[PDB]
Amino acid sequence: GSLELELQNLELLVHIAEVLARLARRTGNEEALEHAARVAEEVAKQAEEIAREARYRGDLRLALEALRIMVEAARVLAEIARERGNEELLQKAEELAREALRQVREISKRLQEEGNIELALKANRLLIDALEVLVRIMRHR
Amino acid sequence: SSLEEKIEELVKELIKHTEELRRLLEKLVKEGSEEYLLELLENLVRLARVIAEVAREQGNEELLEEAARLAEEAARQAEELAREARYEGDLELALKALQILVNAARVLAEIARDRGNEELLQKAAELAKEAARQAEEIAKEARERGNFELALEALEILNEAARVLARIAHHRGNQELLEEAWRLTHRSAKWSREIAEQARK
Amino acid sequence: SPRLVLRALENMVRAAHTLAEIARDNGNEEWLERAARLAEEVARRAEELAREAREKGDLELALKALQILVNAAYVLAEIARDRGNEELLKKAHELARKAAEEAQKIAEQARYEGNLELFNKALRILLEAIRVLIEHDDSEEAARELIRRLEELLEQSRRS
């Protein structure tokens, strides 16, 4: 799967950025920290585009996997902004988590209407995980 | 305040959404099953964990009690499905229900640690102890039958239950429980090494 | 059955982490040495499993065994940190660096053959091994070298 492999690379990308941002901030490397912040932002944007493309195709399983990466990128983004006191980046991370939460809710309702219980359970699990990320984002502001 | 009010509104919406999924699965027993019921119970434990974490910071006693009641019902069901799965010869499904039992017992011990409740703490220890006794029984059964993959899956649940029983022993004043959880962890590692050595030969 | 050994080592390293927690909670020192012994044994078994898998050609299995090696080094590093033992921490760092060196060889072959699925799996192990070296590093000289390795890891994944 091309998009499935693309999502695998994006998740690795944002996890490298998370570790890089953590270490760059500890040593005062602003360029490496800004670079890690840009990658985490681009991963969230690319994950949302893949989710939207998957929703166009009707591939709701692929859309849920892309939105999971979107939520994870929003969590990484929010942690970088919290450590820096960056209000603009924190609001960007909160809006990304809110957008992913809305898309998962829409997909979960469509799966429940179709009687697709397997995918509805996955969507509900991501719905719980997405709210935990959003609530944490709202709390360290 | 108002930010806390927005967070409570979000958690209340997730509860209503998850209860709708519960209502959908309940109406699906009208025509038939097992694997998706255990997965719903796993979501309920994950939901109860998120609810209690929100209630702990907001001082919400009503939400914390709602998280506990959601975890006990998930533990009650998982113990029932594990008992039926063993009766019906589905040991793979039984171990999956035992893992939910350990996870529900973990969040119930954490709520009993955040909110002083001795009855809820002993309840959480009784759940983890029951899951550990069944996981070891299933590990010995699968090992005797040569089902090493099933035995290894049971020994992981055994370690997960002993990990929870040990944290209760350190949180509370019990020292004998910390010794029993230590014997179960050693047994999980010992029997796993034996399976690894047999798999090499 | 390598898959059976893999699963048994996962149980073993998880038990070693639990044994270290029970020993640290009780403050029992001989118990903690028994937990570090198990983590060291898992590291030995995981390296031998990854080496035999790499010598046979099963690189997905070798990567999964290297992840167990990284997890064993994490348990040993936490035991060294809580006990303030620099000799054990260096041994834990050496196990993570070995896991990173083995994953680097698998990552290069997967990149050479265009095996992007395996390539992503090997870079993930590389990142996990770096986290062990970063966990409570606080060696600013080593943090600069780890930043460069993470930046190169960023470009390797983005170039694929």
XYZ file of C-alpha atoms in Angstrom:
502
model
C 0.000 0.000 0.000
C 1.401 3.343 -1.118
C -0.599 5.536 1.268
C -0.227 2.934 4.028
C 3.549 3.088 3.576
C 3.316 6.887 3.422
C 1.542 6.877 6.792
C 4.228 4.596 8.243
C 6.930 7.068 7.201
C 4.986 10.042 8.578
C 4.610 8.384 11.987
C 8.346 7.673 12.095
C 9.010 11.249 10.952
C 7.037 12.833 13.792
C 8.592 10.470 16.348
C 12.078 11.479 15.207
C 10.968 15.112 15.459
C 9.660 14.510 18.986
C 13.000 13.105 20.151
C 14.954 15.773 18.259
C 12.875 18.621 19.699
C 13.298 17.207 23.209
C 17.086 17.037 22.865
C 17.527 20.265 20.881
C 15.638 22.235 23.530
C 17.801 20.685 26.262
C 21.026 21.995 24.668
C 19.759 25.311 23.294
C 19.881 24.408 19.590
C 17.157 26.687 18.238
C 17.698 25.632 14.615
C 17.309 21.916 15.340
C 14.318 22.687 17.573
C 12.637 24.812 14.895
C 13.402 22.096 12.336
C 11.743 19.458 14.524
C 8.729 21.744 14.973
C 8.365 22.216 11.208
C 8.501 18.466 10.545
C 5.853 17.731 13.183
C 3.647 20.422 11.633
C 4.130 19.078 8.102
C 3.399 15.516 9.253
C 0.091 16.643 10.766
C -0.795 18.467 7.544
C 0.149 15.500 5.346
C -1.731 13.078 7.610
C -4.898 15.180 7.338
C -4.628 15.263 3.539
C -4.293 11.469 3.441
C -7.301 11.131 5.752
C -9.344 13.433 3.506
C -8.202 11.508 0.426
C -9.122 8.242 2.152
C -12.539 9.679 3.021
C -12.995 10.627 -0.644
C -12.321 7.019 -1.671
C -14.592 5.656 1.051
C -11.625 3.869 2.668
C -12.624 4.620 6.244
C -10.093 2.192 7.732
C -7.246 4.050 6.015
C -8.804 7.358 7.086
C -8.826 6.290 10.742
C -5.162 5.275 10.522
C -4.257 8.636 8.977
C -6.222 10.502 11.654
C -4.404 8.521 14.353
C -1.116 9.869 12.979
C -2.706 13.331 12.873
C -3.594 13.112 16.573
C -0.077 11.923 17.418
C 1.480 14.792 15.457
C -0.791 17.236 17.291
C 0.328 15.769 20.625
C 4.011 16.107 19.697
C 3.399 19.639 18.406
C 1.651 20.664 21.629
C 4.472 19.339 23.821
C 7.021 21.399 21.878
C 4.853 24.510 22.225
C 4.305 23.914 25.952
C 8.035 23.656 26.683
C 8.606 26.914 24.778
C 5.642 28.961 25.984
C 4.676 29.312 22.309
C 1.002 30.286 22.313
C 0.621 30.376 18.520
C 2.032 26.870 18.061
C -0.044 25.560 20.976
C -3.232 26.884 19.371
C -2.179 25.290 16.075
C -1.762 21.952 17.858
C -5.125 22.295 19.616
C -6.898 23.062 16.336
C -5.257 20.036 14.705
C -6.431 17.775 17.536
C -9.907 19.330 17.379
C -10.104 18.794 13.614
C -9.017 15.160 13.924
C -11.544 14.618 16.725
C -14.316 15.990 14.502
C -13.368 13.756 11.565
C -13.196 10.637 13.749
C -16.634 11.459 15.168
C -18.080 11.829 11.661
C -16.512 8.545 10.532
C -17.674 6.757 13.692
C -21.279 7.811 13.060
C -21.093 6.687 9.425
C -19.667 3.311 10.464
C -22.398 2.807 13.073
C -25.078 3.596 10.481
C -23.547 1.074 8.061
C -23.417 -1.579 10.785
C -19.623 -1.803 10.428
C -18.898 -2.802 14.018
C -15.231 -3.742 13.586
C -14.363 -0.311 12.190
C -16.752 1.424 14.602
C -14.815 -0.088 17.511
C -11.524 1.171 16.060
C -13.064 4.618 15.560
C -14.358 4.725 19.142
C -10.926 3.723 20.456
C -9.335 6.555 18.469
C -12.110 8.886 19.654
C -11.120 8.162 23.262
C -7.415 8.582 22.487
C -8.060 11.824 20.587
C -9.994 13.393 23.468
C -7.210 12.474 25.896
C -4.755 14.308 23.637
C -7.046 17.328 23.238
C -7.761 17.598 26.973
C -4.035 17.438 27.742
C -3.423 20.184 25.165
C -6.050 22.416 26.784
C -4.580 21.893 30.262
C -0.934 22.992 29.869
C -1.930 26.441 28.561
C -13.415 27.190 35.435
C -14.855 27.792 31.969
C -11.971 25.796 30.492
C -12.833 23.071 33.001
C -16.468 23.416 31.927
C -15.431 22.886 28.298
C -13.398 19.806 29.247
C -16.315 18.352 31.219
C -18.580 18.982 28.221
C -16.139 17.133 25.952
C -15.895 14.140 28.300
C -19.685 14.051 28.651
C -19.965 13.964 24.852
C -17.512 11.060 24.590
C -19.518 9.175 27.228
C -22.763 9.640 25.293
C -21.019 8.624 22.059
C -19.587 5.457 23.617
C -22.923 4.605 25.248
C -24.493 4.843 21.786
C -22.002 2.233 20.573
C -22.948 0.102 23.581
C -26.616 0.473 22.631
C -25.778 -0.537 19.057
C -23.956 -3.686 20.174
C -26.759 -4.484 22.626
C -29.323 -4.363 19.812
C -27.001 -6.597 17.750
C -27.464 -9.530 20.136
C -30.949 -9.740 18.596
C -29.347 -11.490 15.599
C -25.812 -12.310 16.781
C -20.628 -11.493 18.930
C -17.718 -12.447 21.193
C -14.569 -10.798 19.815
C -16.295 -7.440 19.325
C -17.794 -7.560 22.825
C -14.328 -7.944 24.351
C -13.073 -5.058 22.212
C -15.917 -2.849 23.442
C -14.982 -3.733 27.027
C -11.398 -2.738 26.215
C -12.647 0.647 24.999
C -14.695 1.076 28.186
C -11.590 0.542 30.325
C -9.670 3.028 28.176
C -12.583 5.461 28.469
C -12.719 4.990 32.248
C -8.988 5.749 32.420
C -9.427 9.019 30.510
C -12.476 9.962 32.597
C -10.695 9.445 35.921
C -7.657 11.414 34.734
C -9.930 14.346 33.870
C -11.828 14.107 37.164
C -8.618 13.973 39.217
C -7.448 17.398 38.024
C -10.892 19.038 38.240
C -11.762 17.573 41.645
C -14.882 16.064 40.058
C -16.100 13.416 42.494
C -19.107 12.527 40.325
C -16.979 11.896 37.227
C -14.479 9.830 39.223
C -17.286 7.620 40.538
C -18.617 7.303 36.983
C -15.179 6.116 35.842
C -15.011 3.511 38.615
C -18.497 2.163 37.886
C -17.550 1.916 34.207
C -14.414 -0.062 35.088
C -16.207 -2.478 37.428
C -18.842 -3.319 34.809
C -16.092 -3.952 32.258
C -14.341 -6.190 34.793
C -17.581 -7.995 35.678
C -18.320 -8.757 32.023
C -14.739 -9.722 31.138
C -14.679 -12.216 34.013
C -17.964 -13.678 32.748
C -16.796 -13.938 29.128
C -13.513 -15.505 30.277
C -15.457 -18.133 32.226
C -17.695 -18.911 29.241
C -14.735 -19.023 26.842
C -12.932 -21.585 29.009
C -16.137 -23.625 29.286
C -16.450 -23.598 25.480
C -12.811 -24.500 24.801
C -11.856 -21.057 23.449
C -8.746 -20.413 25.518
C -7.513 -17.699 23.146
C -10.689 -15.694 23.754
C -10.443 -16.402 27.492
C -6.963 -14.868 27.720
C -8.188 -11.787 25.848
C -10.902 -11.382 28.488
C -8.367 -11.844 31.294
C -6.267 -8.984 29.899
C -9.293 -6.676 30.067
C -9.785 -7.890 33.639
C -6.242 -6.817 34.562
C -6.610 -3.461 32.798
C -9.906 -2.733 34.556
C -8.347 -3.739 37.881
C -5.444 -1.335 37.294
C -7.657 1.723 36.825
C -9.809 0.662 39.791
C -6.757 0.520 42.056
C -5.652 3.943 40.804
C -9.038 5.504 41.572
C -8.906 3.853 45.002
C -5.473 5.462 45.416
C -6.654 8.897 44.271
C -9.904 8.639 46.270
C -9.550 6.922 49.642
C -11.658 3.774 49.317
C -10.557 0.566 51.033
C -13.412 -1.487 49.564
C -12.513 -0.418 46.021
C -8.824 -1.179 46.610
C -9.492 -4.704 47.886
C -11.868 -5.120 44.941
C -9.091 -4.222 42.495
C -6.691 -6.653 44.177
C -9.299 -9.428 44.070
C -9.744 -8.891 40.326
C -6.006 -8.938 39.592
C -5.562 -12.004 41.808
C -8.369 -13.842 40.002
C -6.880 -12.990 36.603
C -3.454 -14.159 37.787
C -4.820 -17.467 39.091
C -6.609 -18.124 35.795
C -3.637 -17.025 33.679
C -1.333 -19.425 35.532
C -3.886 -22.241 35.245
C -4.166 -21.572 31.509
C -0.370 -21.368 31.208
C 0.036 -24.789 32.837
C -2.770 -26.233 30.698
C -1.323 -24.886 27.441
C 2.197 -25.969 28.417
C 1.016 -29.513 29.157
C -0.821 -29.616 25.811
C 2.272 -28.366 23.969
C 0.613 -25.051 23.045
C 3.621 -22.847 23.724
C 2.209 -19.748 22.007
C -0.924 -19.870 24.165
C 1.194 -20.551 27.260
C 3.393 -17.531 26.516
C 0.314 -15.339 26.044
C -0.972 -16.491 29.437
C 2.378 -15.791 31.110
C 2.298 -12.203 29.843
C -1.108 -11.695 31.468
C 0.317 -13.296 34.617
C 3.097 -10.694 34.704
C 0.609 -7.888 34.027
C -1.539 -9.018 36.960
C 1.477 -9.384 39.258
C 2.655 -5.918 38.201
C -0.669 -4.465 39.367
C -0.752 -6.511 42.583
C 2.736 -5.228 43.434
C 1.856 -1.543 43.015
C -1.086 -2.098 45.370
C 1.287 -3.679 47.896
C 3.596 -0.649 47.761
C 0.740 1.876 47.806
C -0.920 0.138 50.763
C 0.805 -1.302 53.833
C 0.873 -4.947 52.733
C 4.287 -6.603 52.462
C 3.161 -10.211 51.963
C 1.354 -9.179 48.768
C 4.608 -7.729 47.424
C 6.145 -11.175 47.972
C 3.332 -13.020 46.179
C 3.450 -10.642 43.209
C 7.204 -11.261 43.197
C 6.727 -15.034 42.979
C 4.241 -14.664 40.116
C 6.642 -12.423 38.192
C 9.474 -14.913 38.717
C 7.208 -17.740 37.544
C 6.279 -15.807 34.398
C 9.958 -15.239 33.598
C 11.028 -18.767 34.579
C 8.412 -20.586 32.492
C 9.052 -18.211 29.582
C 12.772 -19.031 29.615
C 11.920 -22.743 29.615
C 9.716 -22.273 26.547
C 12.490 -20.276 24.861
C 14.985 -23.071 25.549
C 12.603 -25.727 24.219
C 11.967 -23.645 21.089
C 15.706 -23.602 20.340
C 16.092 -27.396 20.461
C 10.559 -21.663 16.399
C 12.197 -18.218 16.361
C 8.737 -16.681 16.757
C 8.344 -18.596 20.027
C 11.751 -17.425 21.278
C 10.869 -13.841 20.322
C 7.648 -13.972 22.344
C 9.390 -15.598 25.316
C 12.056 -12.877 25.374
C 9.340 -10.203 25.335
C 7.786 -11.770 28.440
C 11.230 -12.021 30.033
C 12.206 -8.369 29.560
C 8.769 -7.257 30.775
C 9.223 -9.412 33.880
C 12.680 -7.913 34.454
C 11.125 -4.441 34.376
C 8.531 -5.584 36.919
C 11.189 -7.217 39.112
C 13.139 -3.946 39.147
C 10.030 -2.004 40.172
C 9.192 -4.420 42.999
C 12.805 -4.290 44.184
C 13.016 -0.491 44.037
C 9.637 -0.095 45.751
C 10.650 -2.448 48.573
C 14.199 -1.079 48.574
C 15.562 -4.629 48.423
C 19.076 -4.536 46.976
C 19.610 -8.260 46.360
C 16.227 -8.270 44.611
C 17.351 -5.445 42.313
C 20.492 -7.362 41.348
C 18.203 -10.270 40.451
C 16.214 -7.961 38.166
C 19.357 -6.602 36.503
C 20.541 -10.187 35.994
C 17.366 -11.005 34.060
C 17.627 -7.863 31.923
C 21.246 -8.721 31.102
C 20.252 -12.286 30.195
C 17.520 -10.993 27.874
C 20.051 -8.687 26.210
C 22.371 -11.651 25.606
C 19.547 -13.800 24.225
C 18.138 -10.976 22.087
C 21.504 -10.181 20.488
C 22.100 -13.860 19.704
C 18.584 -14.127 18.265
C 19.079 -11.033 16.097
C 22.509 -12.226 14.944
C 21.213 -15.686 14.016
C 18.281 -14.070 12.203
C 20.605 -11.690 10.350
C 22.919 -14.570 9.423
C 19.920 -16.538 8.109
C 18.315 -13.647 6.199
C 15.183 -13.024 8.306
C 15.651 -9.293 8.816
C 12.151 -8.574 10.144
C 12.830 -11.117 12.894
C 16.258 -9.583 13.532
C 14.680 -6.139 13.919
C 12.128 -7.484 16.408
C 14.938 -9.112 18.392
C 16.868 -5.827 18.343
C 13.821 -4.056 19.790
C 13.953 -6.515 22.694
C 17.669 -5.733 23.010
C 16.827 -2.021 23.202
C 14.138 -2.657 25.825
C 16.614 -4.698 27.875
C 19.139 -1.859 27.686
C 16.395 0.506 28.866
C 15.716 -1.643 31.940
C 19.445 -1.834 32.682
C 19.856 1.927 32.227
C 17.002 2.712 34.625
C 18.524 0.357 37.204
C 21.877 2.096 36.726
C 20.274 5.540 37.056
C 18.359 4.717 40.239
C 21.496 3.121 41.720
C 23.926 5.723 40.355
C 26.125 3.019 38.808
C 28.199 4.396 35.936
C 29.660 1.001 35.001
C 26.203 -0.512 34.481
C 25.027 2.555 32.553
C 27.961 2.281 30.142
C 27.098 -1.386 29.603
C 23.479 -0.392 28.962
C 24.637 2.273 26.497
C 26.861 -0.278 24.745
C 23.898 -2.624 24.266
C 21.813 0.162 22.717
C 24.692 1.222 20.460
C 25.086 -2.402 19.357
C 21.368 -2.610 18.564
C 21.686 0.632 16.592
C 24.700 -0.694 14.679
C 22.832 -3.870 13.720
C 19.723 -1.919 12.697
C 21.899 0.420 10.618
C 23.156 -2.527 8.556
C 19.602 -3.752 7.947
C 18.457 -0.213 7.118
C 21.183 0.173 4.493
C 20.325 -3.096 2.739
C 16.611 -2.247 2.689
C 17.352 1.202 1.258
C 19.684 -0.313 -1.349
C 17.043 -2.801 -2.530
C 14.192 -0.286 -2.333
C 12.534 -2.250 0.488
C 10.792 0.737 2.048
C 8.677 -1.419 4.381
C 11.767 -2.967 5.971
C 13.583 0.382 5.788
C 10.967 2.094 7.964
C 11.144 -0.783 10.456
C 14.931 -0.523 10.754
C 14.899 3.262 11.183
C 12.345 2.804 13.971
C 14.760 0.512 15.827
C 17.490 3.102 15.238
C 15.322 5.760 16.894
C 14.464 3.510 19.849
C 18.153 2.815 20.476
C 18.924 6.548 20.402
C 16.207 7.179 23.002
C 18.051 4.877 25.416
C 21.246 6.883 24.898
C 19.235 10.098 25.295
C 17.255 8.965 28.368
C 18.820 10.915 31.258
C 21.851 11.658 29.089
C 22.667 15.178 30.342
C 26.056 14.854 28.621
C 25.945 17.972 26.451
C 28.827 16.706 24.307
C 26.950 13.469 23.601
C 23.726 15.432 23.077
C 25.335 17.303 20.174
C 26.359 14.045 18.485
C 22.898 12.591 19.114
C 21.300 15.693 17.579
C 23.343 15.173 14.406
C 22.365 11.494 14.319
C 18.700 12.442 14.720
C 18.995 15.083 11.991
C 20.577 12.533 9.651
C 17.792 10.127 10.623
C 15.315 12.851 9.637
C 16.840 13.234 6.169
C 17.126 9.468 5.629
C 13.393 9.021 6.235
C 12.410 12.102 4.218
C 14.598 11.118 1.251
C 12.940 7.689 0.955
